[PDB]
Amino acid sequence: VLLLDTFDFGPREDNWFFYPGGNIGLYCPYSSKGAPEEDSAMVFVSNEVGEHSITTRDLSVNENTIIQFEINVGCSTDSSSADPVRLEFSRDFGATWHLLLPLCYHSSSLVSSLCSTEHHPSSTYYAGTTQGWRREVVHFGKLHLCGSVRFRWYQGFYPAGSQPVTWAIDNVYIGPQCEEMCYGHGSCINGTKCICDPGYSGPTCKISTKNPDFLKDDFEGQLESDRFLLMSGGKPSRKCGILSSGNNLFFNEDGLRMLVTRDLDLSHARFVQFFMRLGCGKGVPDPRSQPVLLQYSLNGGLSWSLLQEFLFSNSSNVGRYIALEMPLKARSGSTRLRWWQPSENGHFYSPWVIDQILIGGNISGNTVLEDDFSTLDSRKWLLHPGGTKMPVCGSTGDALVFIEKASTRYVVTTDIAVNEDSFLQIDFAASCSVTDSCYAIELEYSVDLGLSWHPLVRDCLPTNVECSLQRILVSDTFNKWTRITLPLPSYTRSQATRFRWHQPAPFDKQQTWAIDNVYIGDGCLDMCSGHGRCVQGSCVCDEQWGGLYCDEPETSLPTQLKDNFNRAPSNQNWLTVSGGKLSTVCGAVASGLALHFSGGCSRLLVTVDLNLTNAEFIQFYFMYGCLITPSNRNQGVLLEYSVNGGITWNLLMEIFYDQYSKPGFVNILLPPDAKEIATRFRWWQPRHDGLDQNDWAIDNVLISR
């Protein structure tokens, strides 16, 4: 043991050669977790004239020597490069001095350097790095420091009228390291004893209480939390924004720029993701701008490994979504991450912003994500700009609702494993008759942690006239709460697929929407037959439906359907009528009124489910172009049937676009697989040129024998 001083008496006389400007006292004690009696420290107050520093006697050091101490510079978060404290050593009895730990980033080959692979700041302690005291430890193993050396904490020389930042040090230990360096979770005493930090225990502070397996900061909440151990140089701001609403964390000061997380349980973590903007101006960022380094530590910050360097470039000055998979080596019960932008002097050439930090996920193979939105769990719903947990449109409890004024509206799920048995099933609503606007909400998937998003359902006509997104969540058909069930296509299969509901900008405030009763997974069977919802691996049937998978009607289905369309379409015959209304515009199609589809949005007609086991035919009268004739083949109405409650459809007839300029009669013999105990029909027009364009009419439907 070479040197120990707690300053709790006064200073130990033999320890120190000099301490100009230093006086025993208290500095910034009220955050400190240490005992009150221990708060006595060596303080260097701003107004002291002359040198501000403290120098040790000459000591004999070796590769196993550490310097360990606690420091507070400035008792604030007002970050500054002015008058930092430098920890230095001298090999010539104080004639010359050098930083004990150099700044290590990318070293020149023209010079002698001790830096190796690990990127780290120097033993320089800047004002406004943190309000709290902190422990620093420097190990000599890498420093080629052996023999007689003296050390100093040095700030500067200050004439009268100077006002450098006040600082203080405490609990200085210089001597042999402790075993395992106390795993970076304790203070070493004499190399023989570890004094463990809270939540760490045992001889070497190896054993940890469980750490959280998830971190979120959107910077809309508190800036003092258990989430970050350091937030040096970052302030909440709306400047240099990335997202359309809310604060970001903004680095626009000098000194240290370093954001350090608490220790996390990342043993099953999949990802770190965040938004970042490197540079805030219209031109190209200054080429001297130093990169933001993302690093991790397994040992309480004793050593750091690189995840990614993010360089300033001609394109970096636009907000960007960033996501990385958590590598195996970073996955432990106790891993912290940091974002650090190096600088040799505490000066920076550009600001930067970070926002919406999420760390977590789960690599253990989970195949199910479900929610009724009784709560909004951040671990399941990663991003939801514009979205609020609240009731709307007579929802079952709360829903996730996009109603407030916003420039961005989307919601992203966490990742799940998707396989051949996977399906997506949600309730969705648009504006609930608040607006009559025609709009759609995109449903998308990513297999790369949100780096790219692709439409879940592709434009693919069963006629193969058009094939390559298909608008599904549309505001007329889904005006009020409506269920959709989609088998997940092969291209979505992976061990980590996530989903996004996206309202592309620009959109109007009144074009609102919501989701509820979400199930994405491979449970239940038959996707509940179109007549129920999967809840915790069990089908919950709609009213009037029963059986294990909701395939059994409580009351016998009709065996025929007939409609002359001389009265308003009835829910006894029709489940859906969008874009169609009874009129005489077509003349007689069969007779009197016809159901005329000329709406500017969806044009869709769906029957109730029918028992067609013994039925023989479907027939109807049909006309195109009562107003404007269809201009191409993809505008042909498709007649399809479903035997699974509208989940999947089978083409029966393409009602060819350039036919039926005069009313015609269609008579089709039902195929075997359309003759089931529960089957529905739909007429839908995949494309049209809008209101009163490429219109069609139907009359005298008969599905019978």
Ligand SMILES: *[C@@H]1O[C@H](CO)[C@@H](O[C@@H]2O[C@H](CO)[C@@H](O[C@@H]3O[C@H](CO)[C@@H](O)[C@H](O)[C@@H]3O)[C@H](O)[C@H]2NC(C)=O)[C@H](O)[C@H]1NC(C)=O
């Ligand atoms: C699906 O629909 C078929 C009809 O195509 C149903 O089969 C029919 O079931 C009814 C019972 O409600 C039987 O009706 C009875 O017919 C006798 C004939 O003399 C009459 O005396 C009774 O008063 C009554 O009307 C009918 O025989 C039978 N037809 C056939 C071809 O079997 C069937 O029940 C339906 N399936 C499901 C799953 O509900």
Ligand SMILES: *[C@@H]1O[C@H](CO)[C@@H](O[C@@H]2O[C@H](CO)[C@@H](O)[C@H](O)[C@H]2NC(C)=O)[C@H](O)[C@H]1NC(C)=O
């Ligand atoms: C990570 O995901 C896995 C899912 O594979 C979770 O482990 C399951 O947890 C539930 C508890 O409700 C059990 O019913 C399963 O039997 C567990 N399976 C396995 C393989 O252990 C795990 O809980 C998730 N981690 C966290 C912390 O949420």
Ligand SMILES: *[C@@H]1O[C@H](CO)[C@@H](O)[C@H](O)[C@H]1NC(C)=O
């Ligand atoms: C550490 O060594 C110093 C030598 O000055 C001694 O005063 C102190 O009691 C020792 N501490 C422990 C806990 O061994």
Ligand SMILES: *[C@@H]1O[C@H](CO)[C@@H](O)[C@H](O)[C@H]1NC(C)=O
């Ligand atoms: C970015 O801008 C600088 C100066 O405007 C230019 O010289 C440089 O080549 C640009 N970078 C790239 C790769 O386009």
Ligand SMILES: [Ca+2]
């Ligand atoms: Ca003390």
Ligand SMILES: [Ca+2]
């Ligand atoms: Ca934010």
Ligand SMILES: [Ca+2]
């Ligand atoms: Ca709900």
Ligand SMILES: [Ca+2]
């Ligand atoms: Ca009619």
Ligand SMILES: [Zn+2]
């Ligand atoms: Zn590097």
Ligand SMILES: [Zn+2]
């Ligand atoms: Zn999109």
